[PDB]
Amino acid sequence: MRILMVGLDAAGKTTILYKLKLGEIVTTIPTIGFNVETVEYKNISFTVWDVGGQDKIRPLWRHYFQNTQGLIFVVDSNDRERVNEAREELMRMLAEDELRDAVLLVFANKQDLPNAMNAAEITDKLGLHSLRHRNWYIQATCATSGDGLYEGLDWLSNQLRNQK
Ligand SMILES: Nc1nc2c(ncn2[C@@H]2O[C@H](COP(=O)(O)OP(=O)(O)O)[C@@H](O)[C@H]2O)c(=O)[nH]1
Numbered sequence: 001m002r003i004l005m006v007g008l009d010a011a012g013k014t015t016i017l018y019k020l021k022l023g024e025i026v027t028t029i030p031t032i033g034f035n036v037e038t039v040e041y042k043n044i045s046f047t048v049w050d051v052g053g054q055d056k057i058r059p060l061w062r063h064y065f066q067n068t069q070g071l072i073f074v075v076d077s078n079d080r081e082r083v084n085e086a087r088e089e090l091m092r093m094l095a096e097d098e099l100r101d102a103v104l105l106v107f108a109n110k111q112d113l114p115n116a117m118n119a120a121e122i123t124d125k126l127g128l129h130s131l132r133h134r135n136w137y138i139q140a141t142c143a144t145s146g147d148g149l150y151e152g153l154d155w156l157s158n159q160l161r162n163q164k
């Protein structure tokens with residue numbers, strides 16, 4: 001099954017995967033620049049990738065959103081420099097029908113980081129403090145140890161299957 005674990009560059013995508021261990025990741029280069037890591041094997045299927053509009057205008061993203069039922073948002077809580085880079089992509093995932101119920105799994109790892117915004121504004125400059133109604137979920141995620149990952153994956157799985 002497919003859950004699009006979206007996230008910026010160096011957020012934590014490869015680590016989470018390092019744990020799950022869906023087998024050496026085939027990191028090929030589809031479009032001049034746009035790389036996608038089809039980390040899809042067995043029950044789990046993660047079409048890995050990064051942000052960037054929608055490549056050099058190709059309907060592959062749409063076909064992903066259409067068939068996908070999952071939604072794992074990994075927010076480099078630290079990257080406070082490009083902060084809105086997510087909001088920019090998310091911009092489309094706003095109205096999009098294909099991904100209505102799809103539970104957005106806000107894995108907010110890298111919060112305790114000295115660089116990142118102070119403790120309180122952690123969930124501020126993100127916009128997840130006021131944005132409600134949308135289907136989402138956010139718990140303290142520690143990929144290194146493994147914490148955060150459990151509650152997230154389980155909650156998502158249950159919600160999606162149960163909601164319908
Ligand atoms: N200090 C520390 N480093 C992290 C954290 N989690 C992962 N990183 C490291 O940051 C780097 C980028 O993560 P990576 O998995 O390669 O990200 P991806 O590029 O977005 O797939 C790797 O060197 C990770 O080990 C964390 O919260 N604390």
Ligand SMILES: [Mg+2]
Pocket residue numbers: 027037
């Ligand atoms: Mg990669």
